[PDB]
């Protein structure tokens, strides 16, 4: 019903004819019924190409329970969506990132720390960040982590890039995003002792 060609959209109708539905409007769910397990057939499997405009505007009428018990199951297929279905212009993938992942962020040190998402999930992170390791609040989450959480490695790739190309462009970012950005920059190059970089 609610996903008749919609799951067919994600699987099939993404990169198709008049199927430009999900991406453009920028998560442990995406449909909150009894079939929250059917939220995990194929969404993080293929890609995030030109299926952008409509169906998010169509489907912003549910907006409840972004933290379903799929903390590993749909988490698994979203680590796939990282790997398998990373996408086209994956900035707007910050949506589930925003809605769910910060959601998920809230639990990580709430359990221990970001146990399970960092390494792979940087795949579609960087599929998101087009060119320069372009700025997102994924930086914010993971780098607040590597600052305070004792896990400083995954952004060691991303350490001294002159990353740029942020997206305001229908949100996709926040003042706090860069705030945190150079903020953990400061605190970490403190702890990392490249004090000049962070002072900068």
């Amino acid at each position: 019903s609610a996903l008749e060609q919609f799951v067919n959209s994600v699987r099939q109708l993404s990169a198709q004819g008049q199927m430009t539905q999900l991406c453009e409007l920028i998560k442990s769910g995406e449909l909150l019924a009894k079939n929250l397990s059917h939220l995990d057939t194929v969404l993080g499997a293929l890609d995030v190409q030109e299926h952008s405009l409509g169906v998010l505007a169509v489907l912003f009428v549910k907006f409840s329970m972004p933290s379903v018990p799929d903390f590993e199951t749909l988490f698994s297929q979203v680590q796939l969506f990282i790997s398998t279905c990373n996408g086209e212009h994956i900035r707007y993938a910050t949506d589930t990132f925003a809605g769910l992942c910060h959601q998920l962020t809230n639990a990580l040190v709430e359990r221990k720390q970001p146990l399970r998402g960092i390494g792979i999930l940087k795949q579609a992170i960087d599929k998101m960040q087009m060119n320069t390791n372009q700025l997102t609040s994924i930086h914010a989450d993971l780098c607040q982590l590597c600052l305070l959480a004792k896990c400083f490695k995954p952004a060691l790739p991303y350490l001294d890039v002159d990353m740029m190309d942020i997206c305001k462009e229908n949100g996709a970012y926040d003042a706090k995003h860069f705030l945190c950005y150079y903020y953990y920059g400061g605190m970490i190059y403190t702890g990392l002792k490249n004090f000049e970089r962070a002072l900068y």
């Binding site: 700025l135 002159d162 740029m164 190309d165 305001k168 970012y173 003042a175 860069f178 900068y200």
Partner: protein, 209 residues
């Protein structure tokens, strides 16, 4: 305290005015003027101002004391020169108007005493020299340490030498290091302004609340 034009006039003493009890005592006239100069000057034109002083020659010949004071000063008998220097310490104090700049004067005095003797040498030995300036070995070297605070020679001391070696040689490589410092802050600013173009053109700012 712009004593340059001060001494510019001090040299200009024209005796033929010949009278003003409120003007200055010729003792104070010459000492006043010439020591403003002895603060201000660079040695060449001032020796010209001094050794080739003509208009001031009466004013010259007023204080034989201060005359040969600055004479052998530029001739560098620093010991008794500084001696009568801080002997007239008390009497410049005895000047109402020499009091207010005694520190300034004696400051720049011993400064330029340095400036005078030190310039030709390459490694500042102290032993006999300290015997001259009559500053204790520590007080000597701490005068010097002061000097370090501002000094011009890339100089260092084996304290066991009790002796400096003065400034270094190369300026080329100096230029090199300043060059690289230049370039690094250049690139620093450059990325800064790249990111600045971002933040501006990305609408970015901070609201008030």
């Amino acid at each position: 305290r712009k004593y340059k034009q001060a001494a510019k006039c001090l040299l200009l003493a024209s005796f033929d005015h010949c009278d003003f009890p409120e003007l200055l005592s010729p003792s104070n006239v010459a000492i006043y003027g010439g020591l403003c100069a002895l603060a201000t000057f660079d040695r060449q034109e001032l020796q010209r101002n001094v050794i080739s002083s003509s208009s001031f020659k009466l004013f010259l010949e007023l204080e034989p004391q201060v005359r040969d004071i600055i004479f052998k000063f530029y001739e560098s008998k620093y010991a008794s020169c500084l001696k009568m220097l801080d002997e007239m310490k008390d009497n410049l104090l005895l000047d109402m108007y020499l009091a207010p700049h005694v520190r300034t004067l004696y400051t720049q005095i011993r400064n330029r005493a340095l400036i005078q003797y030190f310039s030709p040498y390459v490694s500042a030995d102290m032993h006999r020299m300290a015997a001259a300036f009559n500053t204790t070995v520590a007080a000597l070297e701490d005068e010097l340490t002061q000097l370090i605070l501002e000094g011009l020679i890339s100089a260092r001391v084996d304290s066991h030498s009790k002796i400096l070696y003065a400034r270094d040689v190369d300026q080329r490589s100096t230029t090199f290091e300043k060059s690289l410092l230049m370039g690094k802050e250049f690139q620093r600013r450059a990325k800064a302004m790249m990111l600045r173009a971002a933040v501006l053109r990305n609408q970015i700012h901070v609201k008030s609340p």
